[PDB]
Design a protein around this ligand. Structure first.
Ligand code: HEC
Ligand code: HEC
Ligand code: HEC
Ligand code: HEC
Ligand SMILES: [Cl-]
Ligand SMILES: [Zn+2]
Ligand SMILES: [Zn+2]
Ligand SMILES: [Zn+2]
Ligand SMILES: [Zn+2]
Ligand SMILES: [Zn+2]
Ligand SMILES: [Zn+2]
Ligand SMILES: [Zn+2]
Ligand SMILES: [Zn+2]
Ligand SMILES: [Zn+2]
Ligand SMILES: [Zn+2]
Ligand SMILES: [Zn+2]
Ligand SMILES: [Zn+2]
Ligand SMILES: [Zn+2]
Ligand SMILES: [Zn+2]
Lengths: 106, 106, 106, 106
């Protein structure tokens, strides 16, 4: 998918997690987020279209996805241990990584 | 790209790291390894084609890629820090993650 | 090496990072913060004095220090690659983790 | 505890995991290993006792404990999701991290 569609997948699944009843709903949504983040990895965003892939700016852009992917990994372990509310709350904290990238690169 | 071509990218760049004679060659190889691992995320290997996408087997397959991606992240920081031989040596330790997934799933 | 004193060390060194002129001051403060977090890992907080060491609350308490330690680790790598303003801004983001534990257990 | 007692705790609980009869034994042993690793973090080993705390060797020594602590963290999550065999096999893999530090500093 393109970068726009992977971002819509991240936004919509965050909302499904906040309104979940059960563990099954939370796990499935985190798995969809992990796939979207991994597919987005080598996208060039509009703001950096004149830069090389090996520039400081593109190395920094990719660093944001490493962090996001790490956080989704941990939240999914919480959900699979039966700590559903702890997983929802970790999902709420992911938003600061979202905002950090957007303020520099969007 | 498909799974077999992602694996050939991982294998070539591990050899570049070993024969490297400057820091730039090591940084560039690790970056290519990270891109290939993120692109492999979503693949279904031949041996698990008769399982569901949400099967315990496929969840465990994907967990191996989370582990590899995390180890590459740390190796790249070491290289950028000036600790280049330490980065090469950490790259050699990646082999046990490669071997673990192959024994279970290849 | 009691909990109160480890917390003073966390708070003091965060202010140092916020006011620093140079990269040496940031690296030293981050290293002191990691020491204090590792030293706090095994403490029993006053609010959980009545609980089993194996309770869900105490497992969760310890998990919070693992999260803080991982974030400090990343910020120090950024400082060591010359991305000093980025390490400073990352140190500021630590406050979300500080306050998440405080709201549950302080 | 001193460094020698922390290493005896690490060695003993690794054999406990290998020979475990049930899941509770594996979780307990991992939690004890994490405590010992966190307590060892600030120790000065005999081979480095004459160099300064800011030396590259002490920085590097401490980094190896961060790596060990992260691997125990992931293995405890696997045990708590019910993947206890996988947690046992992950614990076996820790040995290469133990051996790497011993090769360099013991
Ligand atoms: C960089 C490392 C990013 C991270 C981490 C996240 N996002 Fe993002 N997002 C990013 C860019 C560069 C853009 C602009 C893309 C463009 O072509 O215009 C976006 C955009 C969005 C959007 C909406 C705009 C659109 O797609 O048309 C949304 C809704 C969005 N991003 C959501 C989002 C969420 C929920 C994140 C974390 C969970 C997140 N993003 C992380 C770059 C990056
Ligand atoms: C699972 C999580 C894996 C990890 C981690 C790594 N590899 Fe892999 N590799 C995997 C599978 C399932 C397969 C079989 C692919 C097939 O279609 O048959 C492979 C294969 C390879 C190959 C052979 C490629 C071919 O065309 O047959 C190589 C050379 C290879 N893998 C290398 C490799 C390296 C160097 C890794 C780590 C650095 C690594 N792999 C990790 C699954 C997984
Ligand atoms: C739990 C996982 C915690 C994290 C992460 C952090 N803190 Fe904390 N802090 C915690 C507790 C249980 C307490 C109460 C201590 C008591 O005995 O009553 C505290 C306390 C503080 C204090 C006040 C200390 C005092 O003199 O009473 C400060 C100033 C403080 N904490 C700061 C702090 C900072 C800056 C953190 C992150 C950078 C942080 N804490 C994380 C539990 C936990
Ligand atoms: C450095 C970062 C280390 C890691 C990771 C591990 N070990 Fe270690 N170990 C280390 C040192 C410097 C020493 C020497 C201590 C001394 O004063 O001589 C050790 C020693 C041991 C010992 C022997 C203790 C003794 O009788 O003197 C054992 C049995 C041991 N270490 C086990 C061990 C295990 C099982 C580890 C991982 C699971 C491990 N160590 C990691 C430094 C470091
Ligand atoms: Cl080694
Ligand atoms: Zn965790
Ligand atoms: Zn899992
Ligand atoms: Zn961030
Ligand atoms: Zn930010
Ligand atoms: Zn090739
Ligand atoms: Zn590191
Ligand atoms: Zn970097
Ligand atoms: Zn492994
Ligand atoms: Zn294995
Ligand atoms: Zn990083
Ligand atoms: Zn919170
Ligand atoms: Zn994991
Ligand atoms: Zn847990
Ligand atoms: Zn080694």
């Amino acid at each position: 998918a393109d970068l726009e569609d992977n971002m819509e997948t991240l936004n919509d699944n965050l909302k499904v997690i906040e309104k979940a009843d059960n563990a099954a709903q939370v796990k499935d949504a985190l798995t969809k987020m992990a796939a979207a983040a991994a597919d987005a990895w080598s996208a060039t965003p509009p703001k950096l279209e004149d830069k090389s892939p090996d520039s400081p700016e593109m190395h920094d852009f990719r660093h944001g996805f490493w962090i996001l992917i790490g956080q989704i990994h941990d939240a999914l372990h919480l959900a699979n241990e039966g700590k559903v509310k702890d997983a929802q709350e970790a999902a709420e904290h992911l938003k600061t990584t979202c905002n950090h990238c957007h303020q520099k690169y969007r």
